[PDB]
Amino acid sequence: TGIDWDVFCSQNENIPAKFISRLVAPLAVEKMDVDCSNGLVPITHEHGFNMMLIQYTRNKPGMCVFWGPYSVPKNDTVVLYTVTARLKWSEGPPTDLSIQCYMPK
Amino acid sequence: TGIDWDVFCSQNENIPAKFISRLVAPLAVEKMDVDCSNGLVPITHEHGFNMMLIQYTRNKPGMCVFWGPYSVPKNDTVVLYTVTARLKWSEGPPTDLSIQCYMPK
Numbered sequence: 001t002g003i004d005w006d007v008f009c010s011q012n013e014n015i016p017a018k019f020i021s022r023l024v025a026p027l028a029v030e031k032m033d034v035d036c037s038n039g040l041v042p043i044t045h046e047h048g049f050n051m052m053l054i055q056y057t058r059n060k061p062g063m064c065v066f067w068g069p070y071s072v073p074k075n076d077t078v079v080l081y082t083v084t085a086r087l088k089w090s091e092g093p094p095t096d097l098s099i100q101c102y103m104p105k
Numbered sequence: 106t107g108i109d110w111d112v113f114c115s116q117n118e119n120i121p122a123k124f125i126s127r128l129v130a131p132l133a134v135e136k137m138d139v140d141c142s143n144g145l146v147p148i149t150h151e152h153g154f155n156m157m158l159i160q161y162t163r164n165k166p167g168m169c170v171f172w173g174p175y176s177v178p179k180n181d182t183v184v185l186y187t188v189t190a191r192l193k194w195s196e197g198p199p200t201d202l203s204i205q206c207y208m209p210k
C-alpha cells in the first residue's frame with residue numbers, strides 16, 4: 001500500500017484523537033479528504049507527512065469532528081467514533097481509510 | 106437499550122449481510138433510517154421485527170449497499186464494509202448503530 005498510517009485514540013472526549021499518515025513516494029497524490037461530521041476536510045502533507053487532530057465533541061482551524069457515538073452489536077460497554085479519508089492518486093484507484101476510536105460508556 | 110440487534114456478515118461479496126433488529130416495547134419509534142452508499146433507506150418493523158439485507162456490491166427493491174471497502178490501520182489482511190442506522194423515538198435521544206462487516210483481501 002502507498003500510505004503508512006495509524007490512529008492514536010484518546011481516553012477522554014476533550015482530548016482529540018490524532019490521525020497520522022506518511023506517503024510513500026512514486027505516482028503521486030492528487031488530493032486527500034476526510035469525511036467528518038462537520039464537513040469534508042482536506043489534508044495536505046508537508047514533505048509527505050501529516051498529523052491531524054480529530055475531536056470527539058464540538059467544543060472549540062481546519063477542524064474535523066468524529067461521526068458518532070455509535071452503538072456496537074456485541075458490546076454494551078463502549079461506543080464508536082469514526083471518520084473516513086479518501087486520498088486520490090494521479091494514476092490508479094483511490095485509497096479509502098476507516099479511522100475508528102472506541103470510548104467507554 | 107430499547108433495541109435488540111446483531112449483524113450476520115457473509116463470506117462472499119455476492120451474498121449480502123443481514124441486519125436484524127427487534128424493538129423493545131414502551132415510548133415508541135418515530136422512524137428508522139440506514140445510511141447506505143446508494144442513499145438513505147427507511148426501515149419498517151412488522152410487529153417490531155425487521156431483517157434487512159445489505160449488499161456488498163451494486164450488482165442487482167429497497168436495496169442498501171455497504172459503504173466500502175475500507176482499509177484498517179493495523180491489519181492488511183481485511184477490509185471493512187459498513188453502514189449506519191438511526192432510529193428516532195417519540196421521546197428521547199436517537200439511537201445510532203454502527204453495522205460493520207469485514208471481508209478478506
Ligand SMILES: *[C@@H]1O[C@H](CO)[C@@H](O)[C@H](O)[C@H]1NC(C)=O
Nearest residue numbers: 072074075076077078079102
Ligand atoms: C467488547 O466488550 C468487552 C467486554 O465485554 C470489552 O472489554 C471490549 O473492549 C469490547 N470491544 C471493543 C472493540 O471495544
Ligand SMILES: *[C@@H]1O[C@H](CO)[C@@H](O)[C@H](O)[C@H]1NC(C)=O
Nearest residue numbers: 177179180181182183184207
Ligand atoms: C487483524 O489481522 C489479523 C491477522 O494479522 C486477522 O486475523 C484479523 O481478522 C484482523 N482483524 C480484523 C478485525 O479483521
